[PDB]
Design an enzyme around this catalytic site. Structure first.
Site, PDB file in Angstrom:
ATOM      1  N   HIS A  71       0.821  -1.141   0.115  1.00 53.47           N
ATOM      2  CA  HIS A  71      -0.006   0.111   0.114  1.00 53.47           C
ATOM      3  C   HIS A  71       0.789   1.269   0.001  1.00 53.47           C
ATOM      4  CE1 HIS A  71      -3.212  -2.612   0.736  1.00 53.47           C
ATOM      5  NE2 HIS A  71      -2.783  -3.131   1.891  1.00 53.47           N
TER       6      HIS A  71
ATOM      7  N   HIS B 150       5.497   7.091   6.784  1.00 55.69           N
ATOM      8  CA  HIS B 150       5.401   6.650   5.380  1.00 55.69           C
ATOM      9  C   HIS B 150       4.864   7.774   4.386  1.00 55.69           C
ATOM     10  CE1 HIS B 150       1.366   6.172   7.376  1.00 55.69           C
ATOM     11  NE2 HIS B 150       0.884   6.656   6.077  1.00 55.69           N
TER      12      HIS B 150
ATOM     13  N   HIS C  10       1.976   9.109   0.839  1.00 54.14           N
ATOM     14  CA  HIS C  10       1.070   8.721  -0.021  1.00 54.14           C
ATOM     15  C   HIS C  10       1.478   9.889  -1.148  1.00 54.14           C
ATOM     16  CE1 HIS C  10      -1.682   6.911   3.107  1.00 54.14           C
ATOM     17  NE2 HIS C  10      -0.852   7.986   3.964  1.00 54.14           N
TER      18      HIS C  10
ATOM     19  N   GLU D  15      -3.297  13.472   0.635  1.00 55.76           N
ATOM     20  CA  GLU D  15      -4.482  13.007   1.348  1.00 55.76           C
ATOM     21  C   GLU D  15      -5.263  14.284   1.843  1.00 55.76           C
ATOM     22  OE1 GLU D  15      -3.580   9.520   3.483  1.00 55.76           O
ATOM     23  OE2 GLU D  15      -4.326   8.541   1.809  1.00 55.76           O
TER      24      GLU D  15
ATOM     25  N   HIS E 104       3.435  11.035   6.424  1.00 59.38           N
ATOM     26  CA  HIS E 104       2.745  10.858   7.949  1.00 59.38           C
ATOM     27  C   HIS E 104       3.686  10.083   8.689  1.00 59.38           C
ATOM     28  CE1 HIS E 104      -1.201  10.508   5.539  1.00 59.38           C
ATOM     29  NE2 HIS E 104      -1.016  11.914   5.910  1.00 59.38           N
TER      30      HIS E 104
ATOM     31  N   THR F  69      -6.183   6.754   7.631  1.00 60.63           N
ATOM     32  CA  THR F  69      -6.929   7.124   6.254  1.00 60.63           C
ATOM     33  C   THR F  69      -6.772   5.846   5.349  1.00 60.63           C
ATOM     34  OG1 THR F  69      -4.543   7.471   5.207  1.00 60.63           O
ATOM     35  CG2 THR F  69      -5.943   9.401   6.165  1.00 60.63           C
ATOM     36  N   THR F  70      -6.210   4.433   5.844  1.00 62.35           N
ATOM     37  CA  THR F  70      -6.368   3.308   5.184  1.00 62.35           C
ATOM     38  C   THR F  70      -7.359   2.553   6.008  1.00 62.35           C
ATOM     39  OG1 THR F  70      -4.799   1.838   6.047  1.00 62.35           O
ATOM     40  CG2 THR F  70      -4.297   3.531   4.151  1.00 62.35           C
TER      41      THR F  70
HETATM   42  C1  LIG Z   1      -4.741  -2.623  13.321  1.00 65.55           C
HETATM   43  C2  LIG Z   1      -3.986  -1.871  12.403  1.00 65.55           C
HETATM   44  C3  LIG Z   1      -4.227  -0.501  13.072  1.00 65.55           C
HETATM   45  C4  LIG Z   1      -2.339  -2.306  12.591  1.00 65.55           C
HETATM   46  C5  LIG Z   1      -1.937  -3.136  13.796  1.00 65.55           C
HETATM   47  C6  LIG Z   1      -0.642  -3.672  13.684  1.00 65.55           C
HETATM   48  C7  LIG Z   1       0.475  -3.020  12.829  1.00 65.55           C
HETATM   49  C8  LIG Z   1      -0.287  -2.081  11.623  1.00 65.55           C
HETATM   50  C9  LIG Z   1      -1.394  -1.790  11.717  1.00 65.55           C
HETATM   51  N1  LIG Z   1      -1.930  -0.872  10.595  1.00 65.55           N
HETATM   52  C10 LIG Z   1      -1.706   0.286  10.772  1.00 65.55           C
HETATM   53  O1  LIG Z   1      -0.764   0.865  11.420  1.00 65.55           O
HETATM   54  N2  LIG Z   1      -2.247   0.928   9.731  1.00 65.55           N
HETATM   55  C11 LIG Z   1      -2.169   2.505   9.480  1.00 65.55           C
HETATM   56  C12 LIG Z   1      -1.140   3.239   9.992  1.00 65.55           C
HETATM   57  C13 LIG Z   1      -1.269   4.674   9.456  1.00 65.55           C
HETATM   58  C14 LIG Z   1      -2.039   5.155   8.518  1.00 65.55           C
HETATM   59  S1  LIG Z   1      -2.252   6.774   8.307  1.00 65.55           S
HETATM   60  N3  LIG Z   1      -2.380   6.771   6.688  1.00 65.55           N
HETATM   61  O2  LIG Z   1      -3.669   7.349   8.741  1.00 65.55           O
HETATM   62  O3  LIG Z   1      -1.131   7.423   8.815  1.00 65.55           O
HETATM   63  C15 LIG Z   1      -2.996   4.279   8.129  1.00 65.55           C
HETATM   64  C16 LIG Z   1      -3.181   2.930   8.430  1.00 65.55           C
HETATM   65 ZN   LIG Z   2      -0.735   7.537   5.895  1.00 62.52          ZN
END
Ligand SMILES: CC(C)c1ccccc1NC(=O)Nc1ccc(S(N)(=O)=O)cc1
Ligand SMILES: [Zn+2]
Length: 258
Positions: A62, A92, A94, A104, A117, A196-197
């Site tokens: 992603h 990371h 976008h 975004e 971000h 945002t994902t």
């Molecule tokens: C259950 C999710 C939150 C999880 C658990 C363990 C490791 C990674 C994750 N996933 C994420 O960290 N996802 C994530 C992190 C940051 C963002 S953002 N684009 O809003 O900054 C969008 C998605």
């Molecule tokens: Zn992000």
């Protein structure tokens, strides 16, 4: 199938698996600069990255994440709208297929070429996994990118991307200093929002810097050479991995500046 950014699995589809997609505090949003209100009560923002310890860079299908050792109290964000201390876990970006899109958040409907971000979790919740289950679990520092002069501090990231071209690839990435990615000013807007994902959890205090950083056309072109697919699968370029602006609903965006 599973979520992504294509025609059949993109942002307009996410709500089927993740109903919170249509929730009351979703991100990103358009920042209407004239309606945002200066809040003199905001305390100064504090970004302390001198001891940040990067470990690894990962293409997760992603985006790509630069990951930090968050087992000690090192790289922290505090102040501003935040109560307590939040610890840096990863950053990371976008970005777009074209310079004219990619961010975004938007500013008076303006799309930047990309958005960085820096993700932090509230240390009162012990770790990231517990923090994302809380309304004040995360603070994400958002920074817009525009195409112009190169950002020298980004180049070490750009040059390792060839080693993580496809989904699931990671590479060692130590001693990277994220202070090299920050603009001069820490003037910001802030509002309560979400990831945002997917899973789109409503756990984020967004802090979006007003001053963009400049990166070169050659730097962002290298982002666009990454792949969403895994090795041995058909090549699909990792571009346009952004969610469009979501309804503001019953929220106010506050500014740290006048
Ligand atoms: C259950 C999710 C939150 C999880 C658990 C363990 C490791 C990674 C994750 N996933 C994420 O960290 N996802 C994530 C992190 C940051 C963002 S953002 N684009 O809003 O900054 C969008 C998605
Ligand atoms: Zn992000």
């Amino acid at each position: 199938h599973h979520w992504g950014y294509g025609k059949h699995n993109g942002p307009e589809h996410w709500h089927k698996d993740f109903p919170i997609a249509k929730g009351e505090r979703q991100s990103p949003v358009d920042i209407d600069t004239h309606t945002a209100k200066y809040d003199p009560s905001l305390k100064p923002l504090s970004v302390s990255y001198d001891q940040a310890t990067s470990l690894r860079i990962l293409n997760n299908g992603h985006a790509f994440n630069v990951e930090f050792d968050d087992s000690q109290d090192k790289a922290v964000l505090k102040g501003g709208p935040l109560d307590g201390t939040y610890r840096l876990i990863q950053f990371h970006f976008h970005w777009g297929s074209l310079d004219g899109q990619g961010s975004e958040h938007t500013v008076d409907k303006k799309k930047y070429a990309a958005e960085l971000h820096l993700v932090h979790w509230n240390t009162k919740y012990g770790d990231f996994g517990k923090a994302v289950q809380q309304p004040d679990g995360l603070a994400v520092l958002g920074i817009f990118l525009k195409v112009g002069s190169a950002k020298p501090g980004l180049q070490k990231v750009v040059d390792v991307l060839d080693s993580i071209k496809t989904k699931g690839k990671s590479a060692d990435f130590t001693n990277f200093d994220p202070r090299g990615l920050l603009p001069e000013s820490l003037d910001y807007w802030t509002y309560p929002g979400s990831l945002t994902t997917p899973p789109l959890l409503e756990c984020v205090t967004w802090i979006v810097l007003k001053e963009p950083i400049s990166v070169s056309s050659e730097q962002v072109l290298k982002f666009r050479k990454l792949n969403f697919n895994g090795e041995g699968e058909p090549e699909e370029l990792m571009v346009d991995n952004w969610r469009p602006a979501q309804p503001l609903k019953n929220r106010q965006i506050k500014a740290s500046f006048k």
